[PDB]
Design a protein around this ligand. Sequence first.
Ligand code: FAD
Length: 295
Amino acid sequence: DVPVNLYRPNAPFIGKVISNEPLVKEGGIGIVQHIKFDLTGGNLKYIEGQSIGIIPPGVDKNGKPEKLRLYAIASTRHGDDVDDKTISLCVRQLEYKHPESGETVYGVCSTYLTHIEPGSEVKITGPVGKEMLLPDDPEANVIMLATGTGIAPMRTYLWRMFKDAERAANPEYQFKGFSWLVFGVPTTPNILYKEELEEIQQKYPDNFRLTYAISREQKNPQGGRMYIQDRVAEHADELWQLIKNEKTHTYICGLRGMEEGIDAALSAAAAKEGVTWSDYQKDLKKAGRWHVETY
Ligand SMILES: Cc1cc2nc3c(=O)[nH]c(=O)nc-3n(C[C@H](O)[C@H](O)[C@H](O)COP(=O)(O)OP(=O)(O)OC[C@H]3O[C@@H](n4cnc5c(N)ncnc54)[C@H](O)[C@@H]3O)c2cc1C
C-alpha cells in the first residue's frame, strides 16, 4: 500500500531541520547538502524512490507565494538513523548566469534549503511518486544510472539493500541480486556519499558494482571528458545482457540530457541480437522495469 499525498500544499507538514551537512568536499564544484528533517508529531510515511515537496518562504517576482519544489527522498523509509522518525534530502544549490538581468542567479528553494539552519521549521508535502519504486523481489537486479543529485533515490535503494541496520530492520528484504551504480559527477570531491558507496562495494563485491564517470579527471576513448553515457557505452553489452533478465530493473535519475546517449549505447548492443531497443524499452517501461526521473 504505497503512501501518497499524506500532506498536500494547502496544509503541509511542518517539519524541523535536524542537520544540514555538506556533501561536496573541498575542491569540488558547487554546493550539495544532505538535509535531515524531523517527522515526529505528524504521520508522514514514505518508501524508497519517492519524492517530497518543500515550500520555500517568500514571494516570487510577481508577489505571488512560492510554490513547492519536488526533491527525491535520499533516505530509506526508516530514515538515516533507522528510527522511522526522519527524512533526508540531497539538495544542490542551483546557480546560473545571464544574458540576463544580472550576474549569478540563485535558485529560490535550493538556496533556502542549502543554507537552512538546524531547528528551522520547513513546509513539507507528499510523499509523491510511483515511477521510481524498488521491487520487493530480493533477487532482482538493479541498474542505477545517476548524475549529481540523481544519486538521491539510488541512496535509498542501496541503503535498504546494504546497510547493516537496514538488513536488521527489514527481515523480508535481504538483497541477494546484483546492483550496479554508474555515477557521473565532475570531480572526486563531487562524488556524493563516496565513502559509504565504497564501503558498500568493499563489503558486497558480488552484489554491488560501482562505476564512476568523473568528467574533470577522466577522458573517454575519443578524448572528450568522461560522462555517464561514455561508461554506459563502455559497458553496453554487459548492461544489455543484464537488462534481458526478466527481473532486472533500471533507474535513471538526474538533470535531463543523459537519456539520449544511454539509448544510443543500448540500441547498438541490442541491435547485435536483432532487437530494436526503443521497442524493447517501451515494453520495459510498460512493465514497470524502466524507471526514469530527470529534471
Ligand atoms: C521529481 C523531481 C525530483 C527532484 N529531485 C531533486 C533533488 O534530489 N535534488 C535537487 O537538488 N533538485 C531536485 N529536483 C529539482 C528541484 O525540484 C528544483 O527544481 C531545483 O532545486 C531548483 O529549484 P529552485 O527553487 O532553487 O530554483 P527556481 O528559483 O525555481 O528557479 C528555477 C528556474 O531557473 C531557471 N534555470 C534553471 N536552470 C537554469 C540554467 N542552468 N540556465 C538558465 N536558467 C536556468 C529556469 O527558468 C527555471 O524555471 C527535482 C525535481 C523533480 C521534478
